Symmetry: D2
Subunit: 124 residues, 4 copies
């Protein structure tokens, strides 16, 4: 995977959350997520995918992953998906936008989904 | 998993795309996706997560998954994440919103990401 | 405005909300919105814009509008923007996606914004 | 309007775009937008709304506005809506997320809408 090495490891977003990921040669992303905010404690499983053969023209690397907010400690009856791109070089970034959907009744379905943006760095 | 049985199987969206998924007792989603539209052909790997112990109050089941649009045939240098909820009963649905991010240059990053909504049914 | 006539009037979404709009020759949208759901009662002012000279190739007509959820009855300390396109012909539609932002503290800013989709018709 | 004074004036986002707005005592936003990127040149009309009586608890002020990307120079057959909140004090900000919809054919409607985020400051 072209950015397998670049992506694999520990990442931190602007909220102080921690994303620990392994990138597989096959396009797999596996790891754990720890949210500094919301109805969350400790680590949650994540899985996702990335483009293991990106464009050679200085474009970033498309990727995404999911966390369901259930672990042994808590269940927030919700899942977040991050969609974004990895940008390599001296100050590597993963720039994402995310959708957080809660399980709701049909009456409340219109308010099921939050949208936001997280920027992940290798430091802080 | 409460909706493991409900979720596992073949789903169809309003665009004529096909989503084939296995739900694991542990919250895993694994399978393949075939898009009726865009820079896509044949099946792509998907992975994701779902709430294996949802609320008992008639709420839906939160879930999400990712496809990176690389397979043996094509590479669209992009990934989609679907975030939504499974709603059980006679006419079972998965109601999603999705983010599609393309790898871009930093100049074009502002236009990296599409947002849309897909509704999945067990028929048609 | 090419679709001035097409757009002007009363529209209904899938939630039973009512959107009453005048399209101006200059691209203006003005009117009122009444939400069937959420922290809302009676009519709220809306303003927005539309493409008064759309493509002639069967493309829809881009448009958007805002409601701030303050009127004489209530203040939900929030605003929704609908972004979408008007599609003309026998069963005219306005197909939208929307962002609802609440005023929050900086601590809660990550959860400030909902995303959804509304489809508006001239009947029901 | 509590933040009428705070909001009215010239704002700059991270892309180098310029947003010139007047906030009305009644919740109105009117002005012009000049995009540093995309199929845009010179100024475009904007209109929108803001919460003229926000919470007193340190919450931001909800607001939104629309630009249709037609002016005397160009027509990009598209509209953007920004949804966000104004945050007052020494380093005032407008933190937004936006939807950009293009007029499309029904075949291409699934790819009609971009999502992004802009942060506006009074300097740079
Ligand atoms: C690409 N439009
Ligand atoms: C507010 N939940």
């Amino acid at each position: 995977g072209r950015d397998e090495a670049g992506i694999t490891g520990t990442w931190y977003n602007q909220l102080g959350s921690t994303f620990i990921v392994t990138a597989g040669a096959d396009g797999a992303l596996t790891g754990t997520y720890e949210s500094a905010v919301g109805n969350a404690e400790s680590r949650y499983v994540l899985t996702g995918r990335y483009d293991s053969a990106p464009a050679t023209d200085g474009s970033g690397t498309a990727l995404g992953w999911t966390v369901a907010w259930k672990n042994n400690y808590r269940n927030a009856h919700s899942a977040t998906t991050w969609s974004g791109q990895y940008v390599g070089g001296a100050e590597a970034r993963i720039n994402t936008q995310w959708l957080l959907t809660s399980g709701t009744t049909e009456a409340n379905a219109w308010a099921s989904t939050y949208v936001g943006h997280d920027t992940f760095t290798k430091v802080k």
